[PDB]
Amino acid sequence: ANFNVAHGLAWSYYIGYLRLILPGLRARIQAYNQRHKNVLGGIGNHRLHILFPLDCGVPDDLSVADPNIRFLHELPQQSADRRVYTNSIYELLENGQPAGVCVLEYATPLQTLFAMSQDGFSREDRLEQAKLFCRTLEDILADAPEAQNNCRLIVYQEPTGGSFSLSQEILRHLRQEER
Amino acid sequence: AANFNVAHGLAWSYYIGYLRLILPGLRARIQAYNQRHKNVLGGIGNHRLHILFPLDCGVPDDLSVADPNIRFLHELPQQSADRAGIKGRVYTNSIYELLENGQPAGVCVLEYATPLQTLFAMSQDGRAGFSREDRLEQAKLFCRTLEDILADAPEAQNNCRLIVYQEPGGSFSLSQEILRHLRQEER
Numbered sequence: 049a050n051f052n053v054a055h056g057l058a059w060s061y062y063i064g065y066l067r068l069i070l071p072g073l074r075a076r077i078q079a080y081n082q083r084h085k086n087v088l089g090g091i092g093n094h095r096l097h098i099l100f101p102l103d104c105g106v107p108d109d110l111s112v113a114d115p116n117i118r119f120l121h122e123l124p125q126q127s128a129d130r131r132v133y134t135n136s137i138y139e140l141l142e143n144g145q146p147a148g149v150c151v152l153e154y155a156t157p158l159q160t161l162f163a164m165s166q167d168g169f170s171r172e173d174r175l176e177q178a179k180l181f182c183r184t185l186e187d188i189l190a191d192a193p194e195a196q197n198n199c200r201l202i203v204y205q206e207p208t209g210g211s212f213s214l215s216q217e218i219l220r221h222l223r224q225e226e227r
Numbered sequence: 228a229a230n231f232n233v234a235h236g237l238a239w240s241y242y243i244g245y246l247r248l249i250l251p252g253l254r255a256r257i258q259a260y261n262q263r264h265k266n267v268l269g270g271i272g273n274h275r276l277h278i279l280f281p282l283d284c285g286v287p288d289d290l291s292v293a294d295p296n297i298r299f300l301h302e303l304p305q306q307s308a309d310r311a312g313i314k315g316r317v318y319t320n321s322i323y324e325l326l327e328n329g330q331p332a333g334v335c336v337l338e339y340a341t342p343l344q345t346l347f348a349m350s351q352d353g354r355a356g357f358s359r360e361d362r363l364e365q366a367k368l369f370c371r372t373l374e375d376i377l378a379d380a381p382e383a384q385n386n387c388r389l390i391v392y393q394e395p396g397g398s399f400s401l402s403q404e405i406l407r408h409l410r411q412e413e414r
């Protein structure tokens with residue numbers, strides 16, 4: 049196998065990241081809310097929202113994907129006990145008005161798939177690997193209750209500066225989680 | 228979650244997500260460290276990342292404490308960047324001193340191949356179909372695939388050195404293993 053990379057991407061994304069960061073996430077958010085809620089305001093949704101563009105278009109700045117996605121504040125790492133993990137909180141605008149807040153990022157390994165297709169790895173091949181990556185990761189999560197409860201995959205096919213609104217897509221998911 | 232053929236993905240992941248991102252700027256970070264510390268701490272002449280590949284996938288989370296003959300010296304200037312929506316994601320690399328016969332004998336930028344931790348964790352998660360024996364062949368295949376990738380990345384190959392080894396305790400010194408590699412490159 050030279051380009052069957054999806055199983056390795058899914059297992060490393062879970063074992064080397066989600067498994068490690070998700071258990072401490074709620075306590076980091078509770079610390080943030082204690083620090084900020086009386087001034088900046090607090091975060092109600094305690095899940096990590098993971099953007100999964102099947103076309104592997106992964107800008108490093110979410111506002112490049114959609115100008116209605118605005119960086120709010122860093123979610124700092126937990127203090128070292130007596131590799132660091134930081135995350136980024138974003139607000140989502142609708143009608144030039146704040147409509148949602150959450151912890152939000154892309155599934156970074158989709159960038160590996162993107163880079164591979166830029167130099168015998170097709171874009172046909174890339175989409176099949178992206179889909180296999182997603183399905184393998186969802187299979188793993190479905191077997192991991194607490195990890196599954198502390199994050200949400202947001203999967204979509206669009207290339208993100210056309211008519212598709214990534215902010216609207218995230219907001220639909222946020223409003224669905226409150227359900 | 229039953230296809231554990233992960234080594235090809237681990238290699239391409241490590242290359243694109245780490246080596247291609249960190250190796251181009253590494254020499255400049257070492258030069259910047261030398262500039263800030265040369266007249267006090269002494270210079271680091273070897274500018275390559277030394278990457279430890281224990282084929283048994285044993286990765287201590289503190290290399291310095293793990294070995295009495297390997298001592299942390301100084302972190303490099305941090306590399307911070309927006310990464311896939313995480314603002315200011317940080318990549319840190321560390322200089323270590325290697326001791327021999329009790330005395331300092333080498334200094335270099337050093338770390339473990341972190342994907343080996345994934346393979347180790349896989350072999351302990353209670354799933355059927357992945358034992359220590361499967362983990363070893365995935366580790367070898369990961370190493371083999373990564374070296375195949377770097378054979379066609381000459382700039383990356385000139386900015387790092389892969390230190391691949393089996394491990395038996397006192398019949399193998401990691402510091403000795405690293406020193407032999409350092410001395411080979413000086414050649």
Ligand SMILES: Nc1ncnc2c1ncn2[C@@H]1O[C@@H]2COP(=O)(O)O[C@H]3[C@@H](O)[C@H](n4cnc5c(N)ncnc54)O[C@@H]3COP(=O)(O)O[C@H]2[C@H]1O
Nearest residue numbers: 060061064065132133156157240241244245317318341342
């Ligand atoms: N501290 C962190 N912050 C944010 N996300 C994190 C993270 N650590 C892990 N992840 C996520 O998990 C994926 C796999 O991590 P893993 O460490 O297994 O596999 C990593 C690791 O072997 C190496 N690597 C990446 N960042 C590193 C670092 N700061 N130090 C050492 N090695 C790193 O490159 C591989 C692929 O990296 P990539 O980013 O593409 O893919 C990462 C990233 O999506």
